[PDB]
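Notes continue from the previous slide.

Worked example: a multi-chain complex. Inputs as given:
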Amino acid sequence: TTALVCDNGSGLVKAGFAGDDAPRAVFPSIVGRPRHQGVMVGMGQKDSYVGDEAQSKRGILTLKYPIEHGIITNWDDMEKIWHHTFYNELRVAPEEHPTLLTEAPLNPKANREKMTQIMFETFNVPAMYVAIQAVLSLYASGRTTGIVLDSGDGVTHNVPIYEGYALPHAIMRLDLAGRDLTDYLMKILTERGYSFVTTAEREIVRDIKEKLCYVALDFENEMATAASSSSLEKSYELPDGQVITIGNERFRCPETLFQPSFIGMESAGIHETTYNSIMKCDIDIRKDLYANNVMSGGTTMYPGIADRMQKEITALAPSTMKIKIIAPPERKYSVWIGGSILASLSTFQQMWITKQEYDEAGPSIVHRKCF
Amino acid sequence: TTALVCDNGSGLVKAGFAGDDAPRAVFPSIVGRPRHQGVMVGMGQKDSYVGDEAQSKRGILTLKYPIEHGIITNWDDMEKIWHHTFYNELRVAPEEHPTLLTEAPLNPKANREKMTQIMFETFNVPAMYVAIQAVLSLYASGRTTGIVLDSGDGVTHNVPIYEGYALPHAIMRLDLAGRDLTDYLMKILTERGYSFVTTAEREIVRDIKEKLCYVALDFENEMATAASSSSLEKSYELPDGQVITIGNERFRCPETLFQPSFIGMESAGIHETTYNSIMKCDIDIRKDLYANNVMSGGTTMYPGIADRMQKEITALAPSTMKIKIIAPPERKYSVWIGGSILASLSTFQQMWITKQEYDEAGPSIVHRKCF
Amino acid sequence: TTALVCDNGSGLVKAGFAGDDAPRAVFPSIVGRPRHQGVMVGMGQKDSYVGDEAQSKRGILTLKYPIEHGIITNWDDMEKIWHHTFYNELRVAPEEHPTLLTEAPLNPKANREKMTQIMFETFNVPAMYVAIQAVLSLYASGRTTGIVLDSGDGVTHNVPIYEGYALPHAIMRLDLAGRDLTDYLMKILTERGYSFVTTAEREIVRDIKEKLCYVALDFENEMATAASSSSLEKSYELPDGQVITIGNERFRCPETLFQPSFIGMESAGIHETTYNSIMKCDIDIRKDLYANNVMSGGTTMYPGIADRMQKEITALAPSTMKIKIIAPPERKYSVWIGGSILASLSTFQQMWITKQEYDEAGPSIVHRKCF
Amino acid sequence: TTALVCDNGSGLVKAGFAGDDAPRAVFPSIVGRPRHQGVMVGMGQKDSYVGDEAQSKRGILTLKYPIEHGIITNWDDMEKIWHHTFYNELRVAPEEHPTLLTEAPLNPKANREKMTQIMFETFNVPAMYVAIQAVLSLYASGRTTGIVLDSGDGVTHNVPIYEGYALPHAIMRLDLAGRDLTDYLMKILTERGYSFVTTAEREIVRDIKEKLCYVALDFENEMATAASSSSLEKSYELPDGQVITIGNERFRCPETLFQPSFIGMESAGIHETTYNSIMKCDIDIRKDLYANNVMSGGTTMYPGIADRMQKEITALAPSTMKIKIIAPPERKYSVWIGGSILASLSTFQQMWITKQEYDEAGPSIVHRKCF
Amino acid sequence: TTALVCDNGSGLVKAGFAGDDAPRAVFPSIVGRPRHQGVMVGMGQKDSYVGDEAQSKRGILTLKYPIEHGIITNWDDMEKIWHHTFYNELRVAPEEHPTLLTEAPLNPKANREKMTQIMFETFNVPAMYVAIQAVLSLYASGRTTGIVLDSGDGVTHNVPIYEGYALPHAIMRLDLAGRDLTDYLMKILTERGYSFVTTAEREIVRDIKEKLCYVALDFENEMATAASSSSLEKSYELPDGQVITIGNERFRCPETLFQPSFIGMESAGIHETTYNSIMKCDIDIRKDLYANNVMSGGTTMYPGIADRMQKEITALAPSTMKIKIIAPPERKYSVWIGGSILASLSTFQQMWITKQEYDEAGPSIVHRKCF
Ligand SMILES: Nc1ncnc2c1ncn2[C@@H]1O[C@H](COP(=O)(O)OP(=O)(O)O)[C@@H](O)[C@H]1O
Ligand SMILES: Nc1ncnc2c1ncn2[C@@H]1O[C@H](COP(=O)(O)OP(=O)(O)O)[C@@H](O)[C@H]1O
Ligand SMILES: Nc1ncnc2c1ncn2[C@@H]1O[C@H](COP(=O)(O)OP(=O)(O)O)[C@@H](O)[C@H]1O
Ligand SMILES: Nc1ncnc2c1ncn2[C@@H]1O[C@H](COP(=O)(O)OP(=O)(O)O)[C@@H](O)[C@H]1O
Ligand SMILES: Nc1ncnc2c1ncn2[C@@H]1O[C@H](COP(=O)(O)OP(=O)(O)O)[C@@H](O)[C@H]1O
Ligand SMILES: [Mg+2]
Ligand SMILES: [Mg+2]
Ligand SMILES: [Mg+2]
Ligand SMILES: [Mg+2]
Ligand SMILES: [Mg+2]
């Protein structure tokens, strides 16, 4: 019949039917209340703005993100986003089609149980599933081996997979993603005197970094060139028509991926975290993981991120190993296309968690993995 | 049934029923006592002249204005003007029809409380409301976005509105208006030897500026042309039949709008005040305000005021922004037609402050804004 | 070398060199033609009488005043008065010494331009200046702060000054002065049956008020005492030897200063005009103006005018403010001594309008104020 | 020898030698031009008034503040203030003594580079340093741990410090300070009809809030008491001698500290910002920060601000934590006394940026932090 | 004279003189560098924190462990820990007293040679020895037979001993210890949403498991009780004052001892490893080993670990064998007290490796075992 695949993670909700080549719905997943004055409810001024209208009428709204570090925080408000996706954006009657929800690894169980209970209680979904983003992201390439390095707006995580088996003892999760690169760019742009404070202005810095930034191949040489010369400097126009000149900051923001120290995060970068998750694995595997290192999600679409990563992990692993980094076009949709394949896969149809089965067996059903 | 809308501000009282295309009553709102001799009360010489009779029999009267800078000063005398409006000019029995009164922003609370208490105590109005002139002025265009630049005889003020929301943190109010341009013209006309002193003669200079004056597109070029040549000079006939020649003064009076320094007022002009009230607003809004800059009220009917304003704000804001200044015909009635629409609007009928509700909840009721 | 200072205002021409303690020339500034019969010109009967001879041979002459409300009206006749001052009274050759002319504020520009053009055209003055009487009047005290309340025969005006700066937005000018008090006394003396009609008889009432009148401290008590008793009555001898008894009228004439309604003038008195010109000024100044309120000119030499004024403004201003009214002796010469100081002041010598400079730059030169 | 410490921030310049117990110079740091008329430069009327003379002769001057939100805006005019401090107020020859300048955190680099370049170029300071106000403010207590909550006229900021180490990843900066509380009081005082407009009148509201205001312990109870009763009302005398009655407004102005929504600022209050900057820090630290929460600067001298703050953060943090707020007397001088200690500290003498070192190494020297 | 015994293994350094009943020094053996900012070395901020100060000032430090799996990794940093132990903690002059160092079995020879070379080169120890922890642990009981099951922070190992002879062909070593149980608890506590990431937070989970955890007698029954009921749940307070509720996790962490599969370790548990090391031994011995099964070290102090172990090995070995598990109090000090006895034993004094003997015979001396 149909299946509805939703990348439910932080930032863009991607949703729309399986059996299609691209998402049908993509919208920022923000919720906004009128800031300046209490709502003129007697005249019917709508007090909630979710998804697209919020960004369209950004300046008057307290834009809240209801998913923070991949953990759903506001349950009253996340349900408004699902409400909007099914009834307004897709215009699909949700009681009729199964829904494949997706999650980060190593989340609190309570978040999966609430997310399930709502879908069975208020939307009355007929059948449902919660998958892990890094596994779906692999089907999108057609491969059955690789270390899926998945970035995002909220959570970065690695899931090595081999011969279709999933290794659950070497999943890694960082808390480093586009929201932390945005909160860093908002701090390094004040060195030029541009000062963004409110959430609406954050939704402008979240657009600067999308276009202007690029990953410096060698960070310590570009910190020379950006000091001696101004061919690196580039200019961008704000909504009001004022022009920014962004210069040096243009490549320091993605650098924090590789140096989490910059943001105060005591961690390995993403290059040391892929390498650690490989070294943790058995010695027999590693020559196959090095050859199949797949990337997905935004904050892995900066120009040249692959060409740096491959050099930077090459500097760690032995020189007898060829290292190829599979960064296909449309990484932004990798997880959704993985859902659009896996939901149409003829073997999968036994894994759906039928509403009846949850109603009788109780919420612990959701943690089963008879995959 | 009906609603009575009154522009109660300084200068012309505009009044007459909602559901009509134009005011039914327009009269100068002056009060006058016989000056020269104490009134022959035993013979019944009427000692008060309000509205039209005062201007008709101007020369013998001490014309007082009971509203000064939008603040009602004489409570004994303002009530004579409402008395005259309801009983003599409209000939409407006021106990029967709700009345929508209008106010400047940032007025003292005490002025709204007295104005309410009189309407409920002596006129016994059945239901009443006090609105802000710059919000009503926007409905008159049908728009739901724009920076309402409202001039007048007493108070100039800006109210940006967006998507029907009102931003109350960026209302600005100046104290610069037709009464200050009149008091300036009375001072620059003495350079030609015409000297107007009494209030009756002020009600002649208040008519000179209405007809003779115009806004110079470029002030510093016209101060050349008016020096080298006399095509700029123009002539006007007084009530007694003597002819004035007004020359250079003809365009210096509206110039004080843009240069409040001229009148001793330490302020931005109206071009810097619209621009400041825009810059104060959030960056996301500003491209929409620049496109919807609405004007209202007299002292915004001088020929070419729009065509200067648009150049003068264009000189401030970025050159990527189109700036359109919406100065419709009948700016003089914009606020009244806004009242004639808003009072007939089907959603508004819950906002009336019923007499019973004020009688029980006490005068603090008038500051509520469940709009 | 020298400078010639002239109080050119209405009534007494005061003239004579700077660097002296008192005017050298003081004379009534009247012009007179033989009234009764056309002049016996073939026998050489002199048809013009200016200054002192006119008053000396008053009774046969149509005494005209060539300055009316501080505006020069007869240009053919005012030039006779300057002619007489330089050649006959001072006996000074005017081509040789600079002349500091003085003016009322808010005069028509044309009056300053004609007054300049004559001095450069017919007298061929080498260098010249036109100052404002109320500024000069302040130097006479040595102060650099105060509200200069300047009376006169023609024009009353206020000029607040502070720290040597002049505030040009709070100059006030009334049209109320000794000529209007004379024309009022000529009307209230007919209540006793004395009737003065001709201009010569006006030059007698202008001498009655100088001696007999005084300012009543409390007007409404003296209108009692003058009704119940006759210690207030006083007697004066006319030129022919007839005795007047002036009684009640003795203090009603200066009262019109404080109540311009009496003369049909719709105005604040001088006590409300000083107070209005203070209230107009910035709040930071006012405690300094109240302490430095200077008086000058005749019609401010009536006995007790200061002691009333100080009570009458004390009744307006707040009771925390000390109010001191600086009425020095020789108020009549205050403006002239101010000229005799300012013309000898070493900084001033750059402000002279050299004849060459007017000849080349044209009559608009006279309005410059690089003071 | 000596060291000159200057709190260069917005509002009061505090300056005077290290090794003393209190500033030797304290003056408002305003610059003023004569407003009403263009300066009589040929007579030598001084056209600039900085520091004390400006406030002394307030009413005639366009008081500009050359530091706005801690960012120096007018470079031509700020240099007049340093000129006045060194040559006129301290009468110290600046080529001879090192100067410790102080700054807000997160300022634009360009502001530090200009501020340095001027001190080395025009004053020719022999050696100089730019420190951060919140670090110096801690030495003033003698502590080596605490969350320095520093308010001011321009910028509020938090700097947690622990064991003498500075954590640079949890500095927070708001744009909320005495200038915004003044601009709010000027808006809420119009509810009583007092209307202050010009900058001179702002320098009176900036004195009202200093004396009359106090922080309400419980805002929502005092909004009851101020409604039912008038023991809360208090009265104050203006320079002219008129008395204000300030009532309800008396405690709503400091409330905006805790509720930035009131001023249109979308932010946490200062109570949520200290708590956020603590929660951001590592879990091991927090019990030590709660015990050492230091306050400094004006707008942290309102009566009872500490006793509210301690309750309001106690409502957030866990109840097992004792919270002590160290608000010593002379918070106004905390930063200056910190400079007077740190500039005399024997270890510091290697951190001075010698003029030679800047001349050779170039302006990037100023961002080094070999602290 | 004296002898200095040091448990040099991972986690707590235990040190202090032989001939005493308990260690004199016990401290975490961590090394820490300031994380957040490069050290202010010119001011003398100490850049190294070892032992107790590191844990005391935990939150600002990158806590590194210099011993990893019983192998010394950082030679520059381990020497700082010996430096601190001898000079600061014991305050003993090390050139004067022999030192008995202790080691895991089956270590790389290079680790013993470096450890020896440092003690003879930089500390200049007069005489020294490296013993094996599991042999010393037996003397602590006074027994001369038993299978010493020694746990720790780094290495678990078995050494069967019989009649004082050591069997070197049945030493077993696992890589499973308190550091792996900590890294597992940090992963299972995220199921409740508590997420510990940094090393400082690891030093809090390393304290949770010390107090809250206990060994479930029957794991599969307690996984029932913890599902049906909440008497098992227990609560603990963090340093900041926030309370954890730990529940189910409380007994799954020590379970990984018995099921190394849980941590991804392909191994027998400790119950199968004691049993394998017994079965490997000759049939004549085994009835004596079963009766003398001694435990030592932390991660063998969890409540009830003995009472489970004895049941779980009883399930393997024949039912004719009595099995007694000798878990005395103060297992944490067993190895140190074994050193404090063996170093005072009169026969041992010939086994010291004199400095002279190493200087002449070369580093291969350290592997001799003329025991
Ligand atoms: N073309 C791009 N270049 C750089 N960054 C991008 C680009 N597109 C999106 N991003 C950023 O990547 C982040 C995550 O996007 P996305 O992968 O859609 O999140 P999720 O996968 O959780 O929906 C967002 O901050 C987004 O702005
Ligand atoms: N056609 C005109 N041209 C110029 N000025 C005008 C014109 N009509 C009115 N004005 C002046 O505008 C001022 C305000 O008029 P109005 O807008 O009616 O005041 P309000 O809106 O407060 O009633 C008055 O001084 C009036 O004389
Ligand atoms: N002693 C006096 N008492 C009252 N009024 C006087 C006295 N002297 C002069 N006046 C009147 O004051 C008027 C103005 O005189 P004056 O100040 O000389 O005029 P101006 O200053 O314009 O020359 C004249 O009417 C004069 O008669
Ligand atoms: N006693 C006081 N009570 C309340 N506010 C004060 C007091 N003294 C000063 N202020 C206000 O605090 C603000 C900042 O003062 P200050 O701390 O000197 O600024 P800075 O530290 O930047 O020099 C000013 O607006 C000042 O008026
Ligand atoms: N009372 C206890 N209960 C449970 N575990 C403990 C206890 N005390 C210590 N541990 C843990 O045992 C581990 C090893 O401690 P220890 O035996 O001192 O190591 P070593 O013997 O190598 O010095 C450490 O992780 C320690 O936290
Ligand atoms: Mg994603
Ligand atoms: Mg109007
Ligand atoms: Mg005079
Ligand atoms: Mg400060
Ligand atoms: Mg041990």
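Summary box: Residues 3 and 33 of chain A are 32 Å apart (CA to CA). The pocket of magnesium ion (ligand 9) is lined by residues D 7, 9, 133, 152, 297, 335 (CB under 6 Å).
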